[PDB]
């Protein structure tokens, strides 16, 4: 039922992650979801709608991560460590971060996506400001962005240790 | 007939920045360059070749930029404040870093294109490492790349003021 479209949309995220936004096709997603190819035609108006849903799913998924980030950050007082740990998790889900990055690029010239693209980074900033202050919040989100870019380019994310050091240095004071 | 090949190449680069990697086509490049589609197809039989050539062009701009940064780094004693200024100048041209990110993005799903994506990050590392050691060099280049993506996501780059402050934290010791 609605679990069907769900399976299809998650597969499209997996295909977008593996093949890029332009590498998404009905045939690919149907195989990634393991459903008969026609069935991807039933739940979406066209290929572009399937893309939209995939990016939207990754954007709203990521925003609900904030809840759990907020809880973990509020538990203890070693903020840099906790942030480094949480970032390691984020950069562990390669499918999710790639797709989000595809969103960031896509939104650059498709204003129908600017709202979605802003969800996670707007949320992260807001989460961080009252907890570490504006500049630190700024520097940390920027460093986070860098971390994703380096995981993107080299295939391996910075270690939890490498992250703690850098984040520690950005939040200190 | 040239410098026709050059023009086609730069036009392709502009098209990639404007439409995303996936919006590349001979037609758009031909229109952008103001030559017939046949002229573009002569020099670049297939689209991969065209894309590759544009990405290479984009990626080889780094040799020069790095060389430029090397010259400025040598004159001034304050590494942090100089990298910040250099960075502010870089981030002032949205088109420039938009292409960088299109390149990092493409590196994800084309190994052949990975060797081009790495020229800038590895280049910057190599330029800094002897001056400030591995740890700091790598954190700084991560921050820099993070800065490019963040500027693209938000539409406003960090002031040279805050770039200086975070770079300094990152290079200290």
d(CA B49, CA A64): 41
| Experiment used for this model | X-ray
Say how far apart CA A140 and CA A115 lie, in whole Å. 22
Of B108, B139, B153, the CB nearest to A104: B153
Task: Write the CA distances from B62 to A166, B86, B107, integer angstroms.
Answer: 25, 13, 16
Q: What is the dihedral of CA B168, B169, B170, B173, to 10 degrees?
A: 90
Q: In this complex, do A149 and B154 lie within 8 Å of one another by their Cβ atoms?
A: no
**Residue in chain A lying closest to B18 (CA):** A109
Q: Out of B23, B104, B143, name the one closest to residue A142 (CB).
A: B143
How deeply is B41 buried, as exposed, middle or buried, from its count of CB atoms within 10 A (0-12, 13-18, 19+)? middle
How far is it between the farthest Cα atoms of chain A? 58
Q: Resolution, rounded to a tenth of an Å?
A: 2.3
Per the CB < 8 Å rule, is B118 touching A154? yes
Task: Extract the tokens encoding A88.
Answer: 């390691």
Q: Helix, strand or coil for residue A110?
A: coil
Query: For residues A117 and A113, what is the distance between their CA atoms, to the nearest angstrom?
Result: 6
Interface contact B166-A170, CB threshold 8 A: yes
Residues of B with Cβ-Cβ distance to A20 under 8 angstroms: 21-22, 105-106, 108-109
Matching residue, tokens 């990626």: B59
Determine the distance in angstroms separating the CA of B2 from the nearest CA of chain A, rounded to an integer. Answer: 32
Packing angle, helices B79-91 and B47-75, rounded to 10: 150
Q: Does A99 touch chain B (CB under 8 A)?
A: no
A116 touches chain B (CB under 8 A): no
- CA distances for A54 relative to A24, A100, A103, A161, B23, angstroms: 10, 10, 10, 33, 19
- Report how far Cα B139 is from the mean position of its chain's Cα atoms: 18
Question: Tokens 């991969």 appear where?
Answer: B48
Interface test with A, best of B19, B20, B103, B148 (most A CBs within 10 A): B20
Q: Which two tokens stand for residue A9?
A: 């949309």
Query: Are A12 and A24 a contacting pair, CB within 8 Å?
Result: yes
The domain segmentation of chain B, as residue ranges, is: 1-173
SS3 sequence of chain B:
CCCHHHHHHHHHHHHHHHHCHHHCCHHHHHHHHCCCHHHHHHHCCCHHHHHHHHHHHHHHHHHHHHHHHHHHHHHCCCHHHHHHHHHHHHHCCHHHHHHHHHHHHHHCCCHHHHHHHCHHHHHHHHHHHHHHCHHHHHHHHHHHHHHHHHHHHHCCCCCHHHHHHHHHHHHCC
| Residues from chain A contacting residue B162 (CB–CB below 8 Å) | 135, 138-139
**Tokens representing residue B96 in the block:** 């420039």
Exposure of A97 by Cβ count < 10 A (0-12 exposed, 13-18 middle, 19+ buried)?
buried
Q: Does A154 touch chain B (CB under 8 A)?
A: yes
B143 burial type by CB count under 10 A (0-12 exposed, 13-18 middle, 19+ buried):
buried
CA distance A107 to B39: 32
What sign for the dihedral angle of Cα A44, A48, A52, A55?
Answer: positive
For domain A1-173, the CATH superfamily is: Tetracycline Repressor, domain 2 (1.10.357.10)
Q: How far apart are CA A79 and CA B104, in angstroms?
A: 30
């Amino acid at each position: 039922p609605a679990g069907r479209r769900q399976a299809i949309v998650e597969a499209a995220e997996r295909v977008i992650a593996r093949q890029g936004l332009g590498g998404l096709s009905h045939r690919r997603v149907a195989a990634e979801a393991n459903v008969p190819v026609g069935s991807t035609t039933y739940y979406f108006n066209d290929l572009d709608a399937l893309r939209e849903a995939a990016l939207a799913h990754a954007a709203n998924a990521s925003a609900d991560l904030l809840a759990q980030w907020r809880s973990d950050l509020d538990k203890d007082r070693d903020l840099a460590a906790t942030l480094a740990r949480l970032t390691t998790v984020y950069l562990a889900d390669q499918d999710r971060y790639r797709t989000l990055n595809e969103l960031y690029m896509a939104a650059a010239h498709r204003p129908e996506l600017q709202r979605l693209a802003r969800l996670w980074p707007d949320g992260l900033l807001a989460l961080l400001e009252p907890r570490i202050g504006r500049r630190a919040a700024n520097a940390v989100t920027v460093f986070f962005d860098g971390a994703t870019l380096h995981a993107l380019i080299t295939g391996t994310p910075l270690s939890t240790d490498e992250l703690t050091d850098a984040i520690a240095r950005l939040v200190a004071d």
